[PDB]
Every structure is written in structure tokens, then in C-alpha cells.
Amino acid sequence: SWCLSVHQPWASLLVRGIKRVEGRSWYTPHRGRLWIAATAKKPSPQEVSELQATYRLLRGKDVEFPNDYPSGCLLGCVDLIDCLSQKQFKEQFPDISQESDSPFVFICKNPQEMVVKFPIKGNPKIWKLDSKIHQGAKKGLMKQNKA
């Protein structure tokens, strides 16, 4: 029922599993399912090319970027497994600590993308989804439920 607004292209990278941590300046006790919404801010082609270049070298040839990075919509979800200080992240996750230098690092698992993405307006930090879109969001985690 809780959501985080994230700029594109990072937002789709998170729900596809290409980006595995998310850095923020603030700590959250939230754990478990976290919906991911893309903000309205449209990314520039340079941003998209520079990030896709980096992640292609981090993740290899098998990486599958989305064809398009839709803005202003609910995208899917992840499991927020832990939120660590940057110090503990560097110490405890040495294989991936280069992937964020933010003061806090959200460790994300089990990404799932929605079969149909629904328009939505963001809010700060971790915010509560409206019940109607939450219901449609849940049904949308299975490709067969597309209508």
C-alpha cells in the first residue's frame, strides 16, 4: 500500500532489477513491499545513454532495458529488505557498494513490473497509495490478468 516516487530512467531500472539499490538522504524503517512510481520529470537522452552504458558494463550483454521509460505512472514494486547507512553499506556490501554513494541505501529485492502502468501523481518520501489504484496494481503483477 506504500509507494516511492523515483525519476526515470532509474524508476524502470529498479522494477526491472537492473538497479539493485536506491540511495536517499533519509532513513526509512519501511520494510517489505514498496510500490515504485515514476515522476513526471522526463529524462534527457544523454541521461538515458550514460546510465544504460554504465549498467550494460555492470550487468553484461544479457541486460534488457525497457523500450521506453514512461513518466508519471505507477510501474511495479520491490521488496525493501534493509535500509543501511553508507558506512555499513560500504563495509557489508563490498561487491556492490560502488553502486550508490548516498547517505542511506535501500536494499531492494524481488522486482516486479505491472503489466499495465497507470497514471499517478507523486508525493514526498514513502506515501500511501489510493485503494483503487492499489487494487488494480496488485492484479497487474500477473501478465495473464491484463484486460
UniProtKB/Swiss-Prot annotation:
Domain ASCH: 4-98
Maturation and modification: Phosphorylated by NEK6. Polyufmylated by the UFM1-conjugating system composed of the enzymes UBA5, UFC1 and UFL1. Deufmylated by the protease UFSP2. Ufmylation of TRIP4 is promoted by ligand-bound nuclear receptors that compete with UFSP2 for interaction with TRIP4. Nuclear receptors-induced ufmylation promotes the recruitment of additional transcriptional coactivators like EP300 and NCOA1 and therefore the assembly of a coactivator complex facilitating nuclear receptor-mediated transcription.
Subcellular location(s) of the protein: Nucleus; Cytoplasm, Cytosol; Cytoplasm, Cytoskeleton, Microtubule organizing center, Centrosome
Self-association state and partner proteins as the record states: Interacts with the thyroid hormone receptor/TR (via the ligand-binding domain); this interaction requires the presence of thyroid hormone. Interacts with the androgen receptor/AR; in an androgen, testosterone and dihydrotestosterone-dependent manner. Interacts with ESR1 (estrogen ligand-bound); competes with UFSP2. Interacts with UFSP2; competes with ligand-bound ESR1. Interacts with DDRGK1 and UFL1; the interaction with DDRGK1 is direct. Interacts with NCOA1. Interacts with EP300. Part of the ASC-1 complex, that contains TRIP4, ASCC1, ASCC2 and ASCC3.
Disease: Spinal muscular atrophy with congenital bone fractures 1: An autosomal recessive neuromuscular disorder characterized by prenatal-onset spinal muscular atrophy, multiple congenital contractures consistent with arthrogryposis multiplex congenita, respiratory distress, and congenital bone fractures.
Domain notes: The C4-type zinc finger mediates a competitive interaction with UFSP2 and ligand-bound nuclear receptors. It also mediates interaction with the transcriptional coactivators and the basal transcription machinery.
Purpose of the protein: Transcription coactivator which associates with nuclear receptors, transcriptional coactivators including EP300, CREBBP and NCOA1, and basal transcription factors like TBP and TFIIA to facilitate nuclear receptors-mediated transcription. May thereby play an important role in establishing distinct coactivator complexes under different cellular conditions. Plays a role in thyroid hormone receptor and estrogen receptor transactivation. Also involved in androgen receptor transactivation. Plays a pivotal role in the transactivation of NF-kappa-B, SRF and AP1.
Protein name: Activating signal cointegrator 1
Organism: Homo sapiens
Taxonomic lineage: Eukaryota, Metazoa, Chordata, Craniata, Vertebrata
Name of the coding gene: TRIP4
